[PDB]
Structures are given as structure tokens and as C-alpha cells.
Amino acid sequence: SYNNIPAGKDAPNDIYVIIEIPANAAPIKYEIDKDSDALFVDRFMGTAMFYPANYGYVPNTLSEDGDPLDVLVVTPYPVAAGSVIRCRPVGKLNMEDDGGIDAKLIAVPHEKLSPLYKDVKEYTDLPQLLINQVEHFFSHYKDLEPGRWVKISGWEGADVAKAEVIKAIEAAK
Amino acid sequence: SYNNIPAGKDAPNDIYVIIEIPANAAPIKYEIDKDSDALFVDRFMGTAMFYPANYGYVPNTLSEDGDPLDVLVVTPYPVAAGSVIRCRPVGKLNMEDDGGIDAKLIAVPHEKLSPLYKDVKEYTDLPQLLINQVEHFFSHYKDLEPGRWVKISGWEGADVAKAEVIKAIEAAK
Amino acid sequence: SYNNIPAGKDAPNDIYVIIEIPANAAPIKYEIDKDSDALFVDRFMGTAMFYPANYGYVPNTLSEDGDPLDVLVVTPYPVAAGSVIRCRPVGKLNMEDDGGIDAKLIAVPHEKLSPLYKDVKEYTDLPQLLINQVEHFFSHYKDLEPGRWVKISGWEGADVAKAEVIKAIEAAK
Amino acid sequence: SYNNIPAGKDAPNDIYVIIEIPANAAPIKYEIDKDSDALFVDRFMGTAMFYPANYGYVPNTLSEDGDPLDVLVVTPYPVAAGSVIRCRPVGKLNMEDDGGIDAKLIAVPHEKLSPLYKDVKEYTDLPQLLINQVEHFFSHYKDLEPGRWVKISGWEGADVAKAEVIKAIEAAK
Amino acid sequence: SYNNIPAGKDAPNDIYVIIEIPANAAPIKYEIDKDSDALFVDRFMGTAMFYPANYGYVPNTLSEDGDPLDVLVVTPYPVAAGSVIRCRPVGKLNMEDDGGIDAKLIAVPHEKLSPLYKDVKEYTDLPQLLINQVEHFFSHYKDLEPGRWVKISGWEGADVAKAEVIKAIEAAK
Amino acid sequence: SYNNIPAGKDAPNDIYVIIEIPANAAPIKYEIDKDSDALFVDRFMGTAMFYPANYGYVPNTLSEDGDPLDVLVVTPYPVAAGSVIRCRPVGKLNMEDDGGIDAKLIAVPHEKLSPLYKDVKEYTDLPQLLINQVEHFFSHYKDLEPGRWVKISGWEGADVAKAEVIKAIEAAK
Ligand SMILES: [Mg+2]
Ligand SMILES: [Mg+2]
Ligand SMILES: [Mg+2]
Ligand SMILES: [Mg+2]
Ligand SMILES: [Mg+2]
Ligand SMILES: [Mg+2]
Ligand SMILES: [Mg+2]
Ligand SMILES: [Mg+2]
Ligand SMILES: [Mg+2]
Ligand SMILES: [Mg+2]
Ligand SMILES: [Mg+2]
Ligand SMILES: [Mg+2]
Ligand SMILES: [Mg+2]
Ligand SMILES: [Mg+2]
Ligand SMILES: [Mg+2]
Ligand SMILES: [Mg+2]
Ligand SMILES: [Mg+2]
Ligand SMILES: [Mg+2]
């Protein structure tokens, strides 16, 4: 099962993220069910938008909302829902949503998977438009769903993002 | 495993369906294997047709033929093979095929997943062309495979479909 | 060439729209060039959004910005960029953008192309969520491009939309 | 324009086919308009089926019904709508439909485009399942559209198909 | 889990292959993890190439590199990553890579899945171009990853391939 | 027609490229026919490879092989075959093939189309793996076609690439 996957081979610089929603996918919000490891349709999203990067979570972590830590992973090609990417965090997007505090990390593939991100040490080393697209997506993707909303606080860098991994690993143990 | 998913949160009005074949997919007839939870290729379909709705089954149900209850689920976008949709039955298509009695329910997503089906209470509230496409698909998709065949009896409404769910949940106990 | 296509077989109830951008497509903003009939990439759009309906124009019309009249066409499947669809207007979305007044019509296919829209006489007969998605898309698709913006005024019905077609046809003569 | 393309480099053994509908495409029945060269949506097809081969016509041919000769082209990958394939006829499917006589040729790519068809000299050298799929598609794809219908007479071989090309090239002069 | 799937219903003539990479897919090299059954991204491949057949392994086998036996499966349509296909071996491609001896079998679906391969008894009954594409892919897909390389020895037939299946099954006990 | 499109609004820093083959497309080598403006299938390519960037030509130019100048354009999303991209050259790949000298440019979208490439002044500002993928593709894509082959000479920078545009513009006038 997914719970047999550690949070990382060497956290926080070498972690695993289980993908729930591929980048550039149809507007279906999938979530993995802890009790079955199965991909559930949480909802069909209301706006004409798509997640700008692959979206999932670090196994064996615990965030403030009670679920594993949320991570977006930038990849050269969208990966299959349910697949697992070895990656490295480069930034943290601080937000609050209708349910409470909701920070999410952004990460890039580990060097063993690709050389493309070797020089991406901070989220500011990704394309500025991509960073803006990520923030704009979370700012607006709940606009057509009543009772759902997002407040953006802002971005923090790779040191804070790596800290967040450690926090969530320690919270689960 | 899939067997940890209940038949529904509040059956028969609120059920779960595990999808084997997405709507509008390539002509590969996948089936989930009970003893591995794995998606098997049952066959490559012989006709140039596609399933007009997502196709799957209700976990923890048992029909009189020893398999879970079959369900077609209408969705605004096709859902991934192996994913699970919370939905609501609105009708039943009575058929017999080369394997015996073969009724299949038709369902729409629960209102928590989409607002688009709030007025669909009976299968006759779906577009008539879609109902005709479902009937036509099952009447013909086996035409080019030796020894496979379908007889269509007709449709029944939401109350009959809900009673079928109750009966199949009972049988699994 | 495209200019041999009339504005309609029986405008304004029966018109042709040349599609530039398919519904649900990648964020490439194509525009057909008057001087060559060729599809140009006007831009790669800045936001993680998609046109919620097929987007194009009525040939042999002239709208307020000097170009043919803009029309969104709802279809059961997205139609290819550069293809031509026989359709019928059911509404008008009034907007202003960074270039000036920018109304766009919304239309559904002629009954010879699909039976699915026979009961759609006004834009309010389309799904409310789709109407909201169209408004939300135009409100936000320029959010990440400096100097580009949109202000929505509101909708008008089929009779107003049909009068806009007549106005743009006569303005071209 | 398309009318500048000859019927072939060396007809009837070496012909050109302009594709209207790719193999395995969405159920949109496109047709090229003679007076604009533009791809029109003739209709959205009513059944859950797809064309099993690429479908188009030979330019600068004229059958006795006033339209160019129809050709299905088998290719290793589906080709884009509006593109032109150099190919070689290997058979003829005789049909009558709601519009009158409706024979369609079947062809394979010229050896300069692919080595995969060197041993396909007759339509019976193609996979039997594919031949059956073509027949089944035309027998059923109009089933859900009022007033549309097909009668299938049977197949003829490559020599008959080649004579049909010669006859249709003659008629266009 | 996957390990409940036997190596075959009647090995070596009738085997199961769990697919990791679909034919003609994006250049994502998935591998199933033994400890979790989950699909991991091993890497994003460096070259602009795709696997010419579906790629996976036989469960409950052990090959020379300590992992289950590798098999390519030719299918009429690419099958999803993680799905399981009943097939039959027809050849063996002998290679050495940067990790050591690396033979891979090639197989076609069982006749219950498709009639299209009934006459394919040896790998030489597949299209020569496909065999060449498989050799060329393995010869070059690692060309842009330093430290990864492949040397091709050549092919052996179905009887040798079937003996390799028996060898890997017994080696797992 | 395409010939109404100038080589650029302000060559060599602001040019138009007509795309024949989208990035990451199926292995179909399309070429636009000068006499009809139609997209022809030149061949189905022999190797399991794909063009790593969109491929096409500058209208109203003349290269040493007698045809308009060949250009690859890097884009965030593959563009439709036959569409036209406003772009700017950043490098030149010198090659000779079975027909003679065969240099090709690489370009990025003009700033009016996207901000993503503002800092890409030279081909060495693109990802090194992408540059290697382009060279590797041309080195190998003819490996399975007899009589077709490529010799790589090497890359030159943006100043030489801009020169090549001017050379080919002047050659056509
Ligand atoms: Mg969360
Ligand atoms: Mg979550
Ligand atoms: Mg949230
Ligand atoms: Mg089943
Ligand atoms: Mg069943
Ligand atoms: Mg059945
Ligand atoms: Mg406009
Ligand atoms: Mg416009
Ligand atoms: Mg505007
Ligand atoms: Mg036609
Ligand atoms: Mg015809
Ligand atoms: Mg007909
Ligand atoms: Mg191996
Ligand atoms: Mg392996
Ligand atoms: Mg290897
Ligand atoms: Mg050239
Ligand atoms: Mg060329
Ligand atoms: Mg060349």
C-alpha cells in the first residue's frame, strides 16, 4: 500500500510525492482515500481551469488540516494519477481556504529522474509566469463553488519549504 | 483495497461506483480482478464503438450471478479507470447476454460532486439521444465477436434501480 | 477561401461561424488572418484556463472593432480550429476590454447537426454553470497579461443577439 | 486550393486522397466544402462509433452523383483532417444509402510513404477484423439519425476499384 | 496485490504481463515498486523516443538482474500503465546494458483478447519494421543519459522465449 | 494563401514560421505543398521518435535545397499543423543529409506571444537536454529508412541564425 512508501529517501531534500491530479488535466479533482488507497472523484471543478502542475501529497506526513502534506510537482510531462515522483521542494505558497490554513509546496524532480531542474534551487528559478499561474489558479479555482474560497498570503523560499516537509514528517510520528 | 469501500455512504440514494472503463475511451474492455484489485485487459473490443458512459460496479454488492452490481455513470468529463465516483441511481437497463441475466444501472454524480444533475431524477431526464446511444452500444458492441450476444428487454426507473441496490447489498451479507 | 462563405444560409436565425479556438483546448489563442486565411498564434494565454465553448466569428460581418462578429458555439464535442459550424444565436454577452466595446454572441448548432439543442431558445436554457463558466473565463483569462483586461456588463437574449447579427451583416456592405 | 491537386501522380495505381475524417476520431462528421476548401461540420454523429479508417475523397474526380470519389485509407497512424495522402486502391465497398448509390474505395499508402503495405494487393489482404469493422460501421453509424440509412451490397477487388478511379477521372473531364 | 497474480494460467504458453509503460506513450519511464505495488517515475527519458510496444513484467518470476522477467507486448491499442494482459511469448531480444545481461521477451495477446495475432507464432511473424523499431529503440533510448548504454546481441525464437519463462518461474521458488 | 504572409514583420528578429509538424506529435512527416497550400503526408517515419519542437518554414524564403527555410520553434504547447507562429531565431544546426546541405534554425516565440522566452537570446539559453534532443533526433530519425541519412556538423549562435534568415529572404527576391 501507499503507506509503505516513506516520506523520502532523505528528507527534506529527497522526498516522494504521490500524484492525485496530473498537470494540465481535465477539471476533475481526484483525492486518494486513505482507507482503500483508491482514487476518488472529490468533485468536478466549477471553473474552466486546470492545475498548472501535478498535484499530490507526501506519504507518511501530517499537515494542519489532518491530511498528508500537499505538494505541486513541476515535470516535463504530466504524470499518471496515482504515480509516485521522487522530488525536491523549492518553495511554499501560504494560503488559507474555507477549511483553514492551507499551505502547499512546489517541488521539482530529483536529479536521478531528470537533469532539467539542476539549476532550480528556489521557486524563483522556475518561470515567473508559471509561479503566477499557480497562485492565480488557487486564487480562482473555487470561484464558482459556493462556500469554497481561498486567501493568498504569499510565497516563501526553499529553506522554508524544506522546513515544512520536516514539520509534517515529525507531526505524523 | 477496493473491498474497504462501502456500497455507499447512504445507500441506495448515495452509492459508490468503481470505474472500469471511462466514457469515450479506446476500445479496450478492462475489468477489475477481485483477488488483486488490478485492472485486467479482458479483451480488445471487435467493433468500432466506445462506451457512452463510464462503466463500473458497486463494491460490496452481490447480484444473483455472483458479481457486484454493474453501473453506468454519466459525468461531465470521463473519469479515470480505477477511480471511484459517489453517485445516485436513476434507472436500470434490463438485458440478457451470452453470460446470463445482465441488468445494468445508470447513475449520475452526487450533488456534492457537481450541480449539473440536480433535476435528473429518472433516466428519462437524461438526453434521449444518450439513452438511445447506451441501448445501441449494448445492442451492437459484441457484433464482431463469435459467441457473444445481447438481448435488450427495456428500461426501468429510479425506484426499481434503488431496490436493486438494496437487494444486492443484502446479498453481500 | 473563407470569404466565399456567407454569413448564413438564412441569417440571423441560421448562420455560419468559423471556429478559431476549440472548446476545452490548450491555451493557444489562435486567430484567422484576413490576408491569408491562415490560423495565426496570437498568443499563448497567461492563465491556466480554457475557452468553455468553441470560439470564432461570422464571415462577411463587421463588428464594432472593425473585425467580424465574435461568437461562442456550444457543441457536444469540440470542433477543430479552422472548421465551420452552422448554428443559431441564443444570447449576447456584453463586455468591454482593453480595446473597447467587446460583445460576443453565444450560439448552438443547427438542428441538422445535432438534436441536442432543440429546446435551447435562450442562453438561459443552457446549463447555468456553463453560463457562469463563460462569464468567469472572460473575466479572468487576461489576468496575467499586463495591459489586457475585461469588464463584464451582462447578458441579453436571443432576439437582441439576432439583431446584432443583422447589424454586423449590413455594416459589412 | 485543393483543386490544384491532380487525381494522382499515376492513376489509378498511384492516387491522392484528401482526408475529411481521421481514423479513430471524435464523432464529428466533417466535410470539405467545394467552394471554400473549408472543413464544415456536417453533423455530430448519433451513435457511439468512430470511422475505422481515414475517410476522404480523390480530387478532380467525378462520380455519377456529382461528387468526387470516396476513399477509406488505412494508415499506421490517423492523419489530420484536411491532409492529403498518396495511396493505392485495393478494393471497393458497394453500398446504397439515403442519398443514393454510395460506393467507397479502400486504399493503403503508397510505398514511398510506408513499407508496411507492400503485400496488401487486395482488400482481402487487410486484416479480416478490419474489413468487418468497416462494414459494421457503415451498417450502423446512422442508426440513431432519423431518415438516414445504409444498405450494404458487398465488396469488389482492386482491379474493379482501379477501373472506378479511371472512370471518375474521365468524368471530371 | 500484484503478487497474487500467477505468472500464467498455463505458463509458458499462457502468461500474464503487468504493464508499466504503454506503447507510444510520453517519455516517462514508470516502474512498479515491489514494496508498495505503486507506479514510480523512474525517470523522464532523455531522448525523443517512445516504447514501440507495451512494456512490463511477468509476476512471480525472477530474472538475472534479481527482478521479474521483462516482456514487451504488442497490442492493437496501447494498454494503461498498471494494467495486466494475458499474452503469449513469441521471441527474445538478447541485450546487455549498463547493469548487466538484459534480455527482454516479446509477446502477443492471448486469442481470447484479440483474433489479430492467431498467425503470429514467432517474432518474425510480426511486421519487420516493428522488430526493427524495437531494436532501434533499445539501441538509442539511453543515448542522452551518461552512464547508461545498451549493446544488442540479437533475437531468438518462441521456444527459447518460453524456456526463459520457465527458467524465471522456477528461479522465483 | 500562405504566400501572402511575409517572411516577417521585421526580419531577422521578428519572423513568421508556418508549422508543418507539431512538437511531440505522431510520427507522420507532413509537408505543405506549394501548389495547393495543402498539408501532404510525405511519409510515416520509420523510427519510434518524435520531433522535439514544432517544425516548419519561413514563407517567402529560399534555401539551398530550393525550398523555404526550415525552422524549429519551441513553444509551451504544441501548435496546430498549418498554423503560423511569430518568432525569433536563436540558433542554427548545420547538417548535411542524403539530399545535400540541410541547415535548420531553432526559434522561440516573439514577446507579443509569450513572456516565457524573454531571456532566451541564444540556443544555449534553452535547456541543454532540449538542444541535445534536437540534435539526437536529426541524427537518428532516418535510421530505419534506406537511402536516407544525416551528418551533423554542429551548432551556431543567434547572430548566424539571424544571418541565415536574411540569406534566405534575399535568395527568394
Ligand atoms: Mg489539503
Ligand atoms: Mg489534498
Ligand atoms: Mg484547499
Ligand atoms: Mg465487468
Ligand atoms: Mg458484469
Ligand atoms: Mg454483459
Ligand atoms: Mg474581437
Ligand atoms: Mg477575435
Ligand atoms: Mg476581447
Ligand atoms: Mg463526404
Ligand atoms: Mg460522398
Ligand atoms: Mg453515405
Ligand atoms: Mg530489467
Ligand atoms: Mg524493468
Ligand atoms: Mg535495461
Ligand atoms: Mg528542407
Ligand atoms: Mg522541409
Ligand atoms: Mg533533411
Author numbering:
A (entry chain C), B (entry chain A), C (entry chain B), D (entry chain A), E (entry chain B), F (entry chain C): 1 to 173
What did the original publication write about this model?
However, because PPi is stable under normal conditions, inorganic pyrophosphatase (PPase) has evolved to specifically hydrolysis the molecule.
K149R showed a similar activity as WT AbPPase, indicating that the mutation of Lys149 to Arg had no influence on AbPPase activity. In addition, K149R could be co-crystallized with PPi, suggesting that substitution of Lys149 to Arg did not affect the affinity of AbPPase for PPi. In the catalytic center of K149R, M1, and M2 were not located at the same positions as M1 and M2 in the wild-type enzyme. But this variant still displayed almost the same catalytic activity as WT AbPPase.
